[PDB]
Short mmCIF file of C-alpha atoms and ligand atoms in Angstrom, two decimals:
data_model
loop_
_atom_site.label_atom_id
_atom_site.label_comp_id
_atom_site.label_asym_id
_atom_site.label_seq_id
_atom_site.Cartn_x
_atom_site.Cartn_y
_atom_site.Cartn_z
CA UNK A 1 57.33 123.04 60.54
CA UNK A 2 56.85 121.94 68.83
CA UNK A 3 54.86 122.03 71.92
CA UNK A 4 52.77 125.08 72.81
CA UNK A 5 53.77 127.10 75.71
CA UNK A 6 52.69 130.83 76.61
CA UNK A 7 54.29 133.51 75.64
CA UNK A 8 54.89 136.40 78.14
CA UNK A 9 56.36 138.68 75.63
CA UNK A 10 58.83 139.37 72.88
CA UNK A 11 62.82 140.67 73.32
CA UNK A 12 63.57 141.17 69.96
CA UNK A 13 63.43 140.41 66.47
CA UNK A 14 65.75 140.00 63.04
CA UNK A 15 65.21 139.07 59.90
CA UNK A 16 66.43 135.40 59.13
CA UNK A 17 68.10 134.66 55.44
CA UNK A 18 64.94 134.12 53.53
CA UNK A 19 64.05 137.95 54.66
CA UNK A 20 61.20 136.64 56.89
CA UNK A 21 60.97 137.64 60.67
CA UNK A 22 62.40 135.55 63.65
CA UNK A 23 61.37 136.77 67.01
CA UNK A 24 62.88 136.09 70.41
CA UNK A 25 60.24 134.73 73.04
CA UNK A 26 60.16 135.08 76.54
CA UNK A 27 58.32 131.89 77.58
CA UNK A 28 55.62 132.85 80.83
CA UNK A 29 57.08 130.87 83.52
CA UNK A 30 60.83 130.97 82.45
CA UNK A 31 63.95 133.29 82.50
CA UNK A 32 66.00 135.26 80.30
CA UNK A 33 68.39 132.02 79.65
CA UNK A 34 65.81 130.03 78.33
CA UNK A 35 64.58 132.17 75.88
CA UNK A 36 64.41 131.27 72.29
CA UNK A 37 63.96 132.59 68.34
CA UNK A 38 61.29 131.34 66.86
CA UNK A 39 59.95 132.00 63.30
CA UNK A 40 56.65 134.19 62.77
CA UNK A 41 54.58 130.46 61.81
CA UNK A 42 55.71 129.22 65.52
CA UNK A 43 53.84 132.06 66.92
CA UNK A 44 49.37 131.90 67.30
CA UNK A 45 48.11 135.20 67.05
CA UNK A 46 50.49 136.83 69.19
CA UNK A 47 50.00 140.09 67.48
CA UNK A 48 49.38 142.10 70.91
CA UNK A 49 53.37 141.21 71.80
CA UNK A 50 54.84 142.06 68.25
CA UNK A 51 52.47 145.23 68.23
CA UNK A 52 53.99 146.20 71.82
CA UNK A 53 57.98 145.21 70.44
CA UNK A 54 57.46 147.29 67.98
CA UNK A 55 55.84 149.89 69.69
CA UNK A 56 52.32 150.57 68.37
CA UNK A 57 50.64 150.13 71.85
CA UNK B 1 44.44 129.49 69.92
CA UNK B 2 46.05 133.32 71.18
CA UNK B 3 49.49 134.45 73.14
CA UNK B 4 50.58 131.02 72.51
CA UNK B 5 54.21 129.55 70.33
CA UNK B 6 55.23 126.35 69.11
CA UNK B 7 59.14 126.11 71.04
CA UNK B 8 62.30 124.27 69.32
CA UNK B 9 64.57 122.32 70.70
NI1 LIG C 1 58.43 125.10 62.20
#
């Protein structure tokens, strides 16, 4: 169902138990250790980083 | 709203 913050990019993904995608965010601003998953419905078009994870440029 | 996530806790 969280405060915004930018996202500088994305580390990596999995696929939670309902099948759906979780992704791990690298908040703008913040290290590695404060990274966090977050499901696809957390993220606002943010298609540019899971484009670039996944390697379609 | 772009490049932006909701963050939990
Ligand atoms: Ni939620």
């Amino acid at each position: 169902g969280g405060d915004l913050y930018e996202v500088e990019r994305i580390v990596d993904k999995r696929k939670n138990k309902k099948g759906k995608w979780e992704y791990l965010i690298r908040w703008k601003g913040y290290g590695s250790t404060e990274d966090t998953w977050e499901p696809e419905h957390h993220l606002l078009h943010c298609e540019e980083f899971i484009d670039e994870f996944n390697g379609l440029h | 709203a772009t490049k932006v996530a909701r963050k939990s806790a």
